[PDB]
Amino acid sequence: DLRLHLLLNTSVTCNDGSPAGYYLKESRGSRRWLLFLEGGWYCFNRENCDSRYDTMRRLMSSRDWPRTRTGTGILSSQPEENPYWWNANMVFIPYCSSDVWSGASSKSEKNEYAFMGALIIQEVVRELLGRGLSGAKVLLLAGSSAGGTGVLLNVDRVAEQLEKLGYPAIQVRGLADSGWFLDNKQYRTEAIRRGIRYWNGVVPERCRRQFQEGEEWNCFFGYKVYPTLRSPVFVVQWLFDEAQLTVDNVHLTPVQEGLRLYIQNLGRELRHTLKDVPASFAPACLSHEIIIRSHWTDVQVKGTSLPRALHCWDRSLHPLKGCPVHLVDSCPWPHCNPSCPT
Numbered sequence: 001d002l003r004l005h006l007l008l009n010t011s012v013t014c015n016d017g018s019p020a021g022y023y024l025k026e027s028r029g030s031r032r033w034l035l036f037l038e039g040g041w042y043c044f045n046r047e048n049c050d051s052r053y054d055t056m057r058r059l060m061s062s063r064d065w066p067r068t069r070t071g072t073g074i075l076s077s078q079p080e081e082n083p084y085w086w087n088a089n090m091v092f093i094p095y096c097s098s099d100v101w102s103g104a105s106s107k108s109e110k111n112e113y114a115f116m117g118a119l120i121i122q123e124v125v126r127e128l129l130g131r132g133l134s135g136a137k138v139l140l141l142a143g144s145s146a147g148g149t150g151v152l153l154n155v156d157r158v159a160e161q162l163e164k165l166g167y168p169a170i171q172v173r174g175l176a177d178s179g180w181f182l183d184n185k186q187y188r189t190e191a192i193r194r195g196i197r198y199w200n201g202v203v204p205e206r207c208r209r210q211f212q213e214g215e216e217w218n219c220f221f222g223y224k225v226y227p228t229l230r231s232p233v234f235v236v237q238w239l240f241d242e243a244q245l246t247v248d249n250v251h252l253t254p255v256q257e258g259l260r261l262y263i264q265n266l267g268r269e270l271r272h273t274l275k276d277v278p279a280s281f282a283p284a285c286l287s288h289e290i291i292i293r294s295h296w297t298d299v300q301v302k303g304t305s306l307p308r309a310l311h312c313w314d315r316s317l318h319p320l321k322g323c324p325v326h327l328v329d330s331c332p333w334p335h336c337n338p339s340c341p342t
């Protein structure tokens with residue numbers, strides 16, 4: 001089990017002003033640290049955030065958080081469930097800022113909600129340094145869905161934070177799961193543009209300098225922000241991600257030619273954006289998220305599982321014979337890979 005710690009700096013808060021926090025299971029015989037960013041969409045104005053506060057309150061407040069959580073998937077400490085990093089120090093950072101981990105704004109007389117996702121990550125890292133992180137060799141910032149996009153937005157800032165604090169030996173890396181989206185045409189960007197304004201959202205500096213004022217929303221799209229990053233980042237993305245299809249207004253419920261071509265083109269476009277991403281795992285499946293699922297070990301691309309690919313990635317950061325790190329399906333329809341989740 002991972003144990004809850006609310007942030008000692010209580011000015012770093014969830015949406016409603018309650019303290020943010022993290023769940024930790026230490027592994028004193030390890031210098032590897034996995035910090036995982038939870039996902040869960042976002043909200044972008046007063047009315048939609050109010051609605052989220054009524055029925056998704058755990059994503060906006062720590063008041064009801066449990067004292068413990070069970071680590072699953074890549075957060076499991078059992079080698080049978082987690083062949084990759086079972087002995088690591090495990091950190092689960094709950095998503096309670098509704099800002100894709102980008103915000104740096106407090107609750108005030110002018111702001112009903114605080115959007116502090118970028119500051120939550122920084123404060124977690126700072127407080128962990130006093131709990132063993134100061135001795136780390138590798139800090140892997142991982143995350144799923146909105147948390148995967150959060151990795152892309154924050155991994156280089158964590159690296160810069162540790163450098164500035166005097167810890168240049170800690171190697172910061174990212175693992176972005178299900179956070180690599182396309183700003184494509186729907187079958188039948190503006191929400192993020194409005195969100196950034198509402199949240200005081202921040203994006204990585206090199207990407208900000210490319211796109212400039214008013215265009216920072218571009219940096220929430222993996223294929224645009226990834227080339228600007230300096231830290232090594234492994235990208236996990238289903239080719240037919242359900243959240244991508246949802247925003248595209250595709251509801252598979254008789255697939256005629258127009259939709260067939262739309263779906264095939266989506267997979268081809270996603271595959272194209274990953275062509276120059278050397279550490280990636282992109283199976284041809286209709287699904288969403290993978291890394292904290294208990295059966296995350298099951299799917300394979302070209303005969304290689306994700307835990308294996310991540311191990312090969314570790315070796316590459318010390319090509320490798322029989323240990324690949326670039327694993328993108330080429331078949332063009334969901335479940336053309338037999339190992340897809342059923």
Ligand SMILES: CC(C)(C)c1ccc(-c2noc(C(=O)NN)n2)cc1
Nearest residue numbers: 039040041145146149181192220243
């Ligand atoms: C628009 C952008 C790239 C910021 C974005 C698009 C979709 C999601 C998203 N889709 O699904 C989820 C989720 O968090 N599921 N649990 N997030 C997050 C960000």
Ligand SMILES: *[C@@H]1O[C@H](CO)[C@@H](O)[C@H](O)[C@H]1NC(C)=O
Nearest residue numbers: 009010011012119120122123
């Ligand atoms: C608490 O966090 C805020 C926001 O990052 C920061 O400005 C402040 O200095 C922190 N307080 C302490 C005591 O470190």
